[PDB]
């Protein structure tokens, strides 16, 4: 390129005659200095040398319209034009793990029947401490949002559009048939009850016929048909069912095809990100192209402080280093006991022991080069992991649970090339597949609490589990008095555009890989069971699920 002979007072007419006369963009002087040196370093010779001047100015104006950074040119905008010109598919660009705390919150407005973005005020800077804490307003809106999403989903189902009456419409309409949608309370007086945004009514189940493919627990959204009776102000339930689930695509298109994850781009309060159909198709073609990729899921309750577990695991990893996974989910209660505040100082303290376990684990991972530099490690805490265990003492607690603390990750983080310590209800966004992972032992809780109506087993109970979760549309159907939720982060437990796959890890049910409404739900179960180590190989580019085991 020739030596630079372009300067602002000479370029001024042509810069104006393109940007201002055509496109209204204003020639601020510092911006013109930056523009003039950019143009001159590309053209070299004087601006009078033919169409190269207007050609380059047209390119600048077009890229300015792509970046849209304002009504006046400025040097940072000039650099933005340069960056877009430098950029004139790789699956890493689209695969990402999304914690609960990092997931874009959307409130649901029922009046306009649509989602609206809410900024996370951890961004706010004044929230440098206590920026995470929910407001009281988040609590009063929590169960309302579950109802509105459920009611909206019910209205989209063909069977209804008899139709729902809100519970408050019942009052005084004696001895008449009604169809309800309600949150299944148990009142303070003890009687079973349904609640609605408009009110609540006590229910008699003594004559009811429940639909059989479901569990029914307190806090579940249940459809109820029956006759209201004013004489005792009861509602006598004829029959009961969970509201029917809705397939993913059917949900996505009807909500407006939003990008609720940033898989295509981040939303803003003035701009909801849209899930571009063309790019979705390209990604799905790529997703079908990558035959070789594999996600590997270890079982629950991987107690690192048992030598038998570590021995078994060393064998598994010694296979994986031959041919590494794309991704390797570790999960669930990495200590045998829950780790809580030690009562006495004589023994090595509980938090210290928790650190030593991840030292030992990092020592294992050091031996496996192919694994450590090609996989993505994901760690998912369980009831025995650390800051949760402090206050729950190993019981199941506040559910959108934090990633395990970084004071204990450190040695792992030095050896592994890629790691994501993530919330218990973490999400993977793959090329087009949204994938939930969750680690809870739901099956025990459901059977322990299910409503007992008057008036193969493994397959039946696991079908009952997944059908309950996906029809209910939400990973924790229970009342907060039975499973507290951080009020801000309840939006992460909801599943409303049903995930493409779900790793619904449950320590107290058989391994399975069911499909329901196109959602493929896999439970890898306990890691060590019946003298066998167990793990599960999900193949994303075909959605197969090859279970795997080692005897020990």
């Amino acid at each position: 390129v020739l030596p630079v002979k372009i300067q602002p007072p000479l370029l001024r007419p042509l810069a104006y005659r393109v940007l201002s006369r055509k496109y209204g963009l204003s020639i601020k002087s510092d911006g013109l200095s930056a523009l003039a040196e950019f143009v001159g370093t590309n053209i070299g010779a004087n601006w009078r040398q033919g169409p190269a001047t207007i050609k380059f100015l047209e390119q600048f104006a077009a890229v300015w319209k792509q970046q849209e950074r304002g009504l006046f040119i400025d040097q940072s905008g000039v650099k933005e034009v340069i960056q877009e010109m430098k950029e004139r598919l790789d699956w890493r660009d689209y695969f990402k793990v999304i914690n609960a705390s990092q997931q874009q919150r959307f409130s649901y407005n029922p009046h306009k029947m649509q989602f609206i973005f809410v900024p996370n005020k951890k961004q706010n800077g004044l929230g440098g401490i206590a920026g995470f804490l929910p407001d009281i307003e988040d609590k009063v809106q929590m169960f309302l949002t579950r109802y509105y999403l459920t009611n909206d989903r019910v209205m989209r189902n063909e069977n209804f559009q008899m139709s729902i009456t809100p519970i408050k419409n019942l009052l005084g309409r004696d001895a008449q048939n009604f169809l309800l949608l309600g949150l299944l309370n148990k009142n303070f007086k003890g009687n079973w009850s349904l609640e609605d945004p408009s009110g609540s009514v006590e229910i008699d189940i003594s004559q009811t016929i429940p639909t059989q493919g479901h569990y029914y627990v307190p806090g579940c959204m249940v459809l109820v048909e029956g006759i209201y009776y004013s004489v005792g102000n009861k509602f006598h339930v004829t029959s009961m069912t969970l509201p029917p689930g809705e397939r993913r695509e059917i949900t996505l298109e009807t909500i407006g095809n939003l990008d609720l994850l940033g898989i295509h781009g981040i939303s803003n309060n003035n701009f909801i990100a849209r899930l571009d159909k063309d790019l979705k198709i390209r990604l799905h073609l790529l997703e079908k192209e990558l035959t070789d990729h594999k996600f590997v899921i270890l079982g629950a309750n991987l107690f690192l402080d048992d030598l038998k577990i570590m021995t078994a695991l060393s064998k598994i990893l010694q296979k994986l280093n031959d041919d590494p996974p794309t991704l390797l989910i570790w999960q669930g209660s990495f200590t045998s006991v829950p780790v809580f505040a030690s009562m006495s100082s004589r023994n090595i303290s509980s938090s210290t022991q928790f650190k030593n376990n991840f030292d030992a684990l990092a020592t294992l991972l050091s031996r496996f080069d192919n694994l450590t530099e090609n996989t993505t490690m994901i760690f998912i805490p369980g009831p025995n992991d650390l800051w949760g265990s402090m206050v729950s003492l190993g019981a199941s607690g506040t559910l959108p649970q934090d990633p395990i603390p970084s004071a204990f990750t450190k040695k792992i983080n030095k050896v592994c090339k890629n790691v994501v310590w993530s919330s218990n209800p973490t999400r993977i966004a793959y090329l087009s597949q949204e994938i939930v992972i969750f680690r809870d032992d739901l099956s025990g809780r459901f059977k322990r609490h299910r409503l007992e109506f008057p008036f193969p087993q493994k397959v039946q109970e696991t079908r009952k589990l997944v059908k309950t979760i996906l029809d209910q549309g939400h990973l924790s159907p229970f009342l907060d008095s039975l499973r507290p939720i951080s009020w801000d982060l309840d939006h992460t437990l909801t599943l409303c555009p049903i995930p493409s796959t779900m790793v619904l890890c449950d320590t107290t049910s058989a391994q399975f890989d069911l499909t329901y409404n196109g959602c493929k739900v896999i439970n890898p179960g306990s890691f060590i069971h019946n003298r066998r180590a167990r793990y599960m190989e999900y193949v994303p580019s075909s959605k197969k699920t090859i279970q795997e085991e080692i005897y020990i």
Binding site: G128, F143, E195, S351, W387, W487
Partner: protein, 130 residues
């Protein structure tokens, strides 16, 4: 007007095993010797144990905030239902542990952590926000 310059941060029922003494210890109003060592015998307390107890208290208060009952702001009845927008006496719902008090508790925790050099408690406080 005189307002006490010390905000108490008490850890209840801390145990000195060396003499089975059950003391509430106040990390702000106590002198540092009475924090890092007993006050019936004078054996020293293990630092990581002590930080663990402060983290147990911190998480106890975060949980106690999240599990709280809501109360009506004018008739003071408890919110007995799951989906009302306000109390039937027209009053709005408010927390029984208002958010301001919990921000104050977290503030004294960050001060105590910075001053005594409690690395683990400081990492916990940092991992709440970040």
């Amino acid at each position: 007007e005189f307002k006490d310059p010390s905000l108490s941060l008490v850890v209840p029922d801390f145990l000195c095993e060396y003499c089975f003494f059950i003391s509430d210890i106040d990390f702000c109003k106590a002198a540092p010797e009475s924090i890092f060592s007993c006050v019936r015998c004078h054996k020293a307390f293990n630092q990581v144990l002590l930080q663990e107890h402060l983290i147990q208290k911190l998480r106890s208060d975060i949980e106690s905030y999240l599990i709280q009952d809501l109360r009506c702001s004018r008739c003071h009845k408890v919110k007995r239902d799951y989906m009302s927008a306000h109390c039937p006496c027209a009053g709005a719902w408010e927390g029984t542990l208002p958010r301001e008090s919990i921000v104050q508790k977290l503030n004294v925790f960050k001060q105590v952590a910075k001053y005594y050099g409690f690395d683990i408690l400081l990492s916990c406080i940092a991992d709440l926000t970040i």
